[PDB]
Amino acid sequence: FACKTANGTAIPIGGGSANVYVNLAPVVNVGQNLVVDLSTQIFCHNDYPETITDYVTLQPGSAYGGVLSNFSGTVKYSGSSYPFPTTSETPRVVYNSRTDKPWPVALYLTPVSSAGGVAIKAGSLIAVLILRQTNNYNSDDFQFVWNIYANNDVVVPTG
Numbered sequence: 001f002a003c004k005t006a007n008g009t010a011i012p013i014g015g016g017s018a019n020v021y022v023n024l025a026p027v028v029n030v031g032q033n034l035v036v037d038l039s040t041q042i043f044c045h046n047d048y049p050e051t052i053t054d055y056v057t058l059q060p061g062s063a064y065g066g067v068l069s070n071f072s073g074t075v076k077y078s079g080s081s082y083p084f085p086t087t088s089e090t091p092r093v094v095y096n097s098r099t100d101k102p103w104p105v106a107l108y109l110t111p112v113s114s115a116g117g118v119a120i121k122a123g124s125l126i127a128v129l130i131l132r133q134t135n136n137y138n139s140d141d142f143q144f145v146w147n148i149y150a151n152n153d154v155v156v157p158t159g
Helices: none
Strands: 002-005 018-022 033-037 042-045 054-058 073-077 080-084 093-095 105-109 117-120 125-135 142-150 154-157
Touching: 002 018, 033 125, 033 154, 080 105, 105 125
Parallel strands: 018 142
Antiparallel strands: 002 042, 033 105, 054 093, 054 125, 073 080, 073 105, 117 154, 125 142
């Protein structure tokens, strides 16, 4: 399980935690508003698929940070939505190929205002995600943290 950002920046492997800088494009929707689609920003593969299959889950306690710290919403993880901040462990995503594919994650916000918005500055913290990596033929089982930072200035709609 080895990942990088769309800008080309490596993300640590093997249990190291990371500061991960991403571009975001928030959008207002009926119901949940999109904060960031990480599936356009973080790409991952498996460098040893013949010998091991990787499984990755999002752990409880994953949450917004910075100016979004007080907000709730949902996380779409591999085609299903779950409460955010997370209070349970998601099902597993499988990595079994050397070909980069998205980390299939998008973060949404529950409307709490009438037409409000929150400015996110480039360089500021968006979210703190806790990941857990396991595999099929081993007992290796470790957790690590991705601090998600904004690359660009945006307005997140809260209405």
